[PDB]
Design a protein around this motif. Structure first.
Motif, mmCIF file in Angstrom:
data_model
loop_
_atom_site.group_PDB
_atom_site.id
_atom_site.type_symbol
_atom_site.label_atom_id
_atom_site.label_comp_id
_atom_site.label_asym_id
_atom_site.label_seq_id
_atom_site.Cartn_x
_atom_site.Cartn_y
_atom_site.Cartn_z
ATOM 1 N N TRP A 35 9.908 -15.167 -69.509
ATOM 2 C CA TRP A 35 11.235 -14.336 -70.149
ATOM 3 C C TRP A 35 11.042 -14.192 -71.686
ATOM 4 O O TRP A 35 10.940 -13.153 -72.274
ATOM 5 C CB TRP A 35 12.479 -14.808 -69.694
ATOM 6 N N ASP A 89 10.803 -10.855 -59.962
ATOM 7 C CA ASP A 89 12.102 -10.659 -60.761
ATOM 8 C C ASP A 89 12.147 -9.995 -62.055
ATOM 9 O O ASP A 89 12.740 -9.007 -62.482
ATOM 10 C CB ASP A 89 12.795 -12.009 -60.704
ATOM 11 N N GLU A 92 11.485 -6.211 -61.574
ATOM 12 C CA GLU A 92 12.563 -5.748 -61.349
ATOM 13 C C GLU A 92 13.456 -5.416 -62.479
ATOM 14 O O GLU A 92 14.332 -4.572 -62.815
ATOM 15 C CB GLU A 92 13.336 -6.561 -60.140
ATOM 16 N N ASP A 93 13.583 -6.652 -63.294
ATOM 17 C CA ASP A 93 14.429 -6.571 -64.569
ATOM 18 C C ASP A 93 14.434 -5.943 -65.761
ATOM 19 O O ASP A 93 14.804 -5.563 -66.488
ATOM 20 C CB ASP A 93 14.592 -8.162 -64.939
ATOM 21 N N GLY A 134 18.768 -12.935 -70.107
ATOM 22 C CA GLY A 134 18.037 -13.369 -69.192
ATOM 23 C C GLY A 134 18.509 -14.349 -68.391
ATOM 24 O O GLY A 134 18.426 -14.371 -67.078
ATOM 25 N N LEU A 155 20.869 -12.324 -65.932
ATOM 26 C CA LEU A 155 20.132 -11.694 -64.985
ATOM 27 C C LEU A 155 19.770 -12.539 -64.070
ATOM 28 O O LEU A 155 19.635 -12.413 -62.718
ATOM 29 C CB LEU A 155 18.946 -10.979 -65.641
ATOM 30 N N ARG A 156 19.603 -13.921 -64.421
ATOM 31 C CA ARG A 156 19.120 -15.125 -63.394
ATOM 32 C C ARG A 156 20.477 -15.364 -62.584
ATOM 33 O O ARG A 156 20.279 -16.017 -61.271
ATOM 34 C CB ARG A 156 18.464 -16.237 -63.777
ATOM 35 N N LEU A 211 16.014 -3.022 -70.482
ATOM 36 C CA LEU A 211 16.431 -3.715 -69.148
ATOM 37 C C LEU A 211 16.875 -2.693 -68.072
ATOM 38 O O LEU A 211 17.347 -1.570 -68.694
ATOM 39 C CB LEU A 211 17.738 -4.631 -69.601
ATOM 40 N N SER A 212 16.566 -3.019 -66.915
ATOM 41 C CA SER A 212 16.816 -2.026 -65.731
ATOM 42 C C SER A 212 18.322 -2.032 -65.368
ATOM 43 O O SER A 212 18.887 -0.826 -65.019
ATOM 44 C CB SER A 212 16.120 -2.434 -64.562
#
Ligand SMILES: N[C@H](CCC(=O)O)C(=O)O
Ligand SMILES: N[C@H](CCC(=O)O)C(=O)O
Ligand SMILES: N[C@H](CCC(=O)O)C(=O)O
Ligand SMILES: N[C@H](CCC(=O)O)C(=O)O
Ligand SMILES: [Cl-]
Ligand SMILES: [Cl-]
Ligand SMILES: [Cl-]
Ligand SMILES: [Cl-]
Ligand SMILES: [Cl-]
Ligand SMILES: [Cl-]
Ligand SMILES: [Cl-]
Ligand SMILES: [Cl-]
Lengths: 256, 256, 256, 256
Positions: B56, B84, B87-88, D60, D63-64, D89-90
């Protein structure tokens, strides 16, 4: 000075258990705190100044735990951080460079093997004149994979040691892991005295601490293990090197 | 949006240069930024969640440099952080797990070799059914020590691959370094298709980027290297694996 | 021992310059390394154990610069890290808690003002019995904004100090910034002796160092400024507190 | 892809609870994860590039945890990290700069107050032409001390806003804490429209997530508090600001 307190020992990982075993044999009644920095192992390919900072923060952690002495069992961290760490701290600090260098001074032709960082540091020349010195990177993984009695070990020993002087009378095993390879190393260098960092440092620690009244004759001997990476991974690797790890706790690199 | 921007590639160290090389061959006009995290190499023995945080951190750094895409050249970091991460993030993100798992699906009995982290992650079983998997720790240092074509390598390959099912049809080389060991692995596992992560990933990247209009048609290809450890130590090791590192500078772990 | 070596002084930021100035007035021949941890200022609202680890880190850095003594100018870091830091280190280590607590034992009724961390640490009660203790969070930002002579300072002083015991004889100014507030605090507490951490500590450092034979009898002192944040931001804020920063450089928290 | 997922909200500390409260008022069904970086508060005096890195780390982490959207409640972190964070970021990412800057475009003469970092960043000027901008460092600790309604608040407001252009029509309250100071600011700046970051951002979040189909129509959402410093210290500051925090977990900076 409190003789009831534990002796701290630290290394990058499981390899320093050779130093711990030698110490426990001489000092069966002492309590040991063994610190393995497995989140940042190995040290041998890192910058020496980075390893020096690791040693400082681990020493502080051990002092906050109450130790009455510190042993730098790692030859790389000893090369990076001693003598200065011993000069800077009040508690006795011992490393694994000086005792073997001192013993080596009773030979005319002396070699050194260790990690890249150790051989490049100049730490050993400060204490003993060296005829030859060779970084042996594959030795550590060969030991951690359990292959010290395999002919691969003899072949790798040949690859590293072949071009050493016919002169050599003594060789410093200047890495925590190299006592496991005395067989192969000796087969390839018949005649050469092999100087074991763990045994010679254990002797010096037991002597110096006796001299200072810091040993505990009434103690019950035990070891607690503290690691920065995964405790079960450590415990499994330690078992492969013949060490039964009873109590282990993970210490946050944040606690440092 | 901007095809003039570089492609980010990252790994724990020099091993990922096999992926960089395969990419440059297929895309000789692109600008690459290769990030090797040599201060924290190797990843294979670290906790997967720690490697996931590294990835990350490094992805963020590469985005601040303006990359148009990210390739995770490391099999361990791919296992820890993908899918992941893809996707992120908005930019296309590629790893070295899925392309070789895809190719493996055209075989009845598939094996995997990699680091401890990779095989224990379960990343590969998410994309392909595995008949056998095995962590091969000594392969990485054997390669970095330049011994991939020596008898020792054949013996080490035999040590890890002996208990592989007689009926394996394909083996995923699920580690950056393992393309160097095709001779020794093939000699010990004759008849088994060896799937190269570097080439299969470079094929996928070139395809997907062309498909999205993100290739730079008229550029002058070149590579900039960024490492968290010592740059000269890295340049020396990269040459031992056949890469000429011209432009390299050290990135502080504080920069992350 | 070498008297040409510098004295290390550290704080979270610019406030500690009150201690550096007093030190330099008494010791105009000494070379000082002033370390301001402006990347992590302020300390007063952090966990004491976190500040304790900062102090260990910074002491190690200063020792790597060759200092012959360390002054902990920060009352929060002294409260967190002393006396243990002085017991653990070989060089003389001085803080800002003990000298003022010592002066305070010559009074019947003693108060303390400081940061939250300082008042809740219980560091001052180890050395002197307190009738009243109050954390004064707005004092530090009042000083850094340059408002110590404004009526808002009087109103905030009243807000914090009104409920102090009317039989109070002395007040420990237990924070680096509070000498700038002597006027306002004295206005609100007429007749209470204000014990200034900078002056009393400087007195002790000069006393102790002379007794150890560590002062430099010749030559002319200089100051070098070392900060972990932006040096121009530090220089601007120091200028508001009346110091003209000659030599400043940024040290990476990674150097720590 | 799952509207039961939580919405992440982050700030340096308790200030961002103004944004959280405004969100929860508009969105009673949503689960919120409120992340307060109290180990490293405050951001307003740090280098912008440092704050930008913090924002990446915390994003991050969130997101996790599976968040479906991220709200940067901090004006300093928004100034440092947006719009790049939203582009990179998505998931939908929202900050507290753009909505107030949009509302300000319906006025001829617009001013800005905020932290040093925010004012220096140039974040607001990229969205709205400013006639005046002033950093107001004492406002944050004044609010956290609970003094926002007191005479001293009026005098501090006068100290900062005195030199403001007499023809101002609107002032952006560009900091999490400043909604608490509308009384004192408006007393000193009569007739100026005060633009509230928390209310204008919550409005935008609700609109945008509804249009995106991401709101949970059946939820009974709760709030969870995550902080990097001491939970009890956080709880007590929140109480000074009128929020009763019950469920708070300490997140290690090593989890980031
Ligand atoms: N403990 C190290 C070997 C392993 C490492 O590189 O960390 C030494 O004694 O040199
Ligand atoms: N690059 C790693 C090998 C080296 C390491 O353990 O970091 C991999 O592909 O798995
Ligand atoms: N130097 C600190 C005040 C500023 C801070 O909180 O770091 C002290 O003397 O307590
Ligand atoms: N949350 C910050 C104020 C506190 C700090 O400086 O971190 C802001 O909105 O700018
Ligand atoms: Cl470090
Ligand atoms: Cl090595
Ligand atoms: Cl491995
Ligand atoms: Cl399959
Ligand atoms: Cl061979
Ligand atoms: Cl405080
Ligand atoms: Cl500010
Ligand atoms: Cl709650």
């Amino acid at each position: 000075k409190d003789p009831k307190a534990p002796i701290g020992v630290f290394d990058s990982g499981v390899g320093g258990l050779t130093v711990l075993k030698a110490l426990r044999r001489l000092l069966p009644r002492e309590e040991f705190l063994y610190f393995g920095d497995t989140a940042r192992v190995p040290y041998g390919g890192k910058p020496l100044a980075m390893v020096r900072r690791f040693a400082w923060e681990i020493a502080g952690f051990l002092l906050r735990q109450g130790v009455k002495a510190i042993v730098v069992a790692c030859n790389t961290a000893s090369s990076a951080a001693l003598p200065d760490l011993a000069e800077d701290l009040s508690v006795p600090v011992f490393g694994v460079v000086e005792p073997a260098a001192r013993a080596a001074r009773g030979f005319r032709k002396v070699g050194l093997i260790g990690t890249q960082a150790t051989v490049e540091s100049g730490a050993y020349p400060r204490y003993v004149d060296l005829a030859w010195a060779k970084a042996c990177p594959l030795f550590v993984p060969l030991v951690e994979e359990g292959l010290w009695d395999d002919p691969v070990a003899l072949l790798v020993a040949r690859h590293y040691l072949e071009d050493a002087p016919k002169d050599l009378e003594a060789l410093i095993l200047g890495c925590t892991h190299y006592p496991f390879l005395k067989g192969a190393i000796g087969a390839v260098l018949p005649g050469v005295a092999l100087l074991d960092s763990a045994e010679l440092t254990a002797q010096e620690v037991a002597r110096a601490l006796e001299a200072e009244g810091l040993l505990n004759p009434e103690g019950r001997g035990r070891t607690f293990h503290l690691v920065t990476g995964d405790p079960e991974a450590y415990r499994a690797l330690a078992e492969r090197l013949g060490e039964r790890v009873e109590a282990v706790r993970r210490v946050s690199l944040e606690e440092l």
